[PDB]
């Protein structure tokens, strides 16, 4: 029971995981020791009451992004949703959805995405968001709706990975405040990376034991 999904929110420093159908608000601080909890762990469809009667309330968030403004994209399994999640506030409202990723995303049909989405992250360049399945991933512009470029492997676009975990996969991620810094996770291990959108790069060096460098996360991870 690890993350499996993360994106970031719009007060500063400030991310919600997903685990299991739990969730956990939490002050992350990038570069600095008082990584902290605000809120949780806490069931989805408590903290949530617009996805009390969802099959998201059910059974949590598996892969999620935000996007601009209060909102983020929330999947679990073949569907998702965009919601608008009223940080900090009883205020949250599902505002497309829920539907069928083939039905968000008609790009997606056919692809491996098609039934499913590991992880994700918002990009700083335009309404573009990379999403991750398997040893592929994906570039995509949200709001025109559109593959910016074919699928490919995922050290093809992100080089630094080859040779660690992540070549294979990525439980969850979610992007930093600081400019093209993203974190992934996977099992009891994370990297922070920093990335370049329209280029193939390096680097962040150190995967790392998640609870090493995340006080606050002992106790919460793993979720069992
Ligand atoms: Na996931």
Known sequence: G??????????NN?????????YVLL???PGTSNDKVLYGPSFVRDGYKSLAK???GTYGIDCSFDTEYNEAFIFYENFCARIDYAPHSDKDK??????????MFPFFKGTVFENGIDAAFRSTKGKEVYLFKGDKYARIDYLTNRLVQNIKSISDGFPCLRGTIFEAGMDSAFASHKTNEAYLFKGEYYARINFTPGSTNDIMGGVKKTLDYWPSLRGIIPLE
């Open 2 to 11: 690890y993350i499996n999904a993360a994106f970031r929110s719009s007060r």
């Open 14 to 22: 400030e991310a919600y995981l997903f685990i299991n159908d739990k």
């Open 27 to 29: 002050d992350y601080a």
């Open 54 to 56: 969802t099959i998201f």
């Open 94 to 103: 599902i505002i497309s959805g829920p539907k069928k990723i083939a039905d």
